Write an enzyme that holds these catalytic residues in place. Structure first.
Site, short mmCIF file in Angstrom:
data_model
loop_
_atom_site.label_atom_id
_atom_site.label_comp_id
_atom_site.label_asym_id
_atom_site.label_seq_id
_atom_site.Cartn_x
_atom_site.Cartn_y
_atom_site.Cartn_z
N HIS A 45 -21.76 -12.56 -25.23
CA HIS A 45 -21.80 -13.95 -25.68
C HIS A 45 -23.10 -14.66 -25.34
O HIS A 45 -23.36 -15.77 -25.81
CB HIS A 45 -20.59 -14.76 -25.17
CG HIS A 45 -20.68 -15.19 -23.73
ND1 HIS A 45 -19.92 -14.61 -22.74
CD2 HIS A 45 -21.37 -16.19 -23.14
CE1 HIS A 45 -20.14 -15.25 -21.60
NE2 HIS A 45 -21.01 -16.22 -21.82
N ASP A 93 -16.89 -8.22 -23.68
CA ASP A 93 -18.02 -9.13 -23.50
C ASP A 93 -19.12 -8.42 -22.72
O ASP A 93 -19.31 -8.65 -21.52
CB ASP A 93 -17.56 -10.39 -22.75
CG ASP A 93 -18.56 -11.52 -22.87
OD1 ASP A 93 -19.59 -11.33 -23.54
OD2 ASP A 93 -18.30 -12.61 -22.30
N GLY A 186 -24.25 -20.50 -17.15
CA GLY A 186 -25.59 -20.10 -16.78
C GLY A 186 -25.54 -18.83 -15.96
O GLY A 186 -26.53 -18.09 -15.90
N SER A 188 -23.26 -16.55 -16.56
CA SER A 188 -22.78 -15.56 -17.51
C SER A 188 -23.74 -14.41 -17.71
O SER A 188 -24.96 -14.61 -17.79
CB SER A 188 -22.51 -16.22 -18.87
OG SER A 188 -21.44 -17.13 -18.78
N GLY A 189 -23.19 -13.21 -17.80
CA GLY A 189 -24.01 -12.03 -18.01
C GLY A 189 -24.51 -11.45 -16.70
O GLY A 189 -24.93 -10.29 -16.64
#
Ligand SMILES: [Ca+2]
Length: 240
Positions: A45, A93, A186, A188-189
């Protein structure tokens, strides 16, 4: 990261900052993990939007030169083929980014250790989340890399009706929920570093938190379980 503290200078060397070009400048948007000199692991995402991305390794303070950074462009983006932008709750994801050039590994830049396929952590396992994400629900990004202790919550407890219910799948890892510490926009990942047999390994890719807020009691941050995608990751880096 909400309720965290500044990580020591380059103490999490596999942590990267994913940024996109905003007109004539760059803005941090997500975290990621360096898994090969030319490959980065992040959330799907984070790269759903068609923007120009760049990866920064050896980063610590987003607003100033620390003298340890390496800036590199993104050549190819490989999103898991089952990823559905409209159903993050469905899982998958995860995405791999081939960098335009191989970065140099050193004191500030190192590869993240991945777990063996199928590895599941026992409840309340010690882990740490790192990132430059919001330091408070609807707040602002952290200028320096933050870290927070975030123990795991097994699938049984996390998928129960007292926590996330059926919104969480077994292909996910839950950590936190003490209402004080958690991931936030922020982060995320980014990685979830967990201690296994004396070694820190990246067991999760930050995926999502509650709509109600980042640090919500009984609403642990949810991560894509890396160990469930080992075969996929290897197949991608072997044919690309
Ligand atoms: Ca810097």
């Amino acid at each position: 990261v909400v309720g965290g503290t500044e990580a020591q200078r380059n103490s999490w060397p596999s942590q990267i900052s994913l940024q996109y070009r905003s007109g004539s400048s760059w803005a941090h948007t997500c975290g990621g993990t360096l898994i090969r000199q030319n490959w980065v692991m992040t959330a799907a995402h984070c790269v759903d939007r068609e923007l120009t991305f760049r990866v920064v390794v050896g980063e610590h303070n987003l607003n100033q030169n620390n003298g340890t950074e390496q800036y590199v462009g993104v050549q190819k983006i490989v999103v898991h083929p089952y990823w559905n932008t409209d159903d993050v709750a469905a899982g998958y994801d995860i995405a791999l980014l081939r960098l335009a050039q191989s970065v140099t590994l050193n004191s500030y830049v190192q590869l993240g250790v991945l777990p063996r396929a199928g590895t599941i952590l026992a409840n309340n396992s010690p882990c740490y989340i790192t990132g430059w994400g919001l330091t408070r629900t609807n707040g602002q990004l952290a200028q320096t890399l933050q870290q927070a202790y975030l123990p795991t919550v097994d699938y049984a407890i996390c998928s129960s009706s007292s926590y996330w219910g059926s919104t969480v799948k077994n292909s996910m890892v839950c950590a936190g929920g003490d209402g004080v510490r958690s991931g936030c926009q922020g982060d995320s990942g980014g990685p979830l570093h967990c201690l296994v047999n004396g070694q820190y390994a990246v067991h999760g890719v930050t995926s999502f938190v509650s709509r109600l807020g980042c640090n919500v009691t009984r609403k642990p941050t949810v991560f894509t379980r890396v160990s469930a995608y080992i075969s996929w990751i290897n197949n991608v880096i072997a044919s690309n």
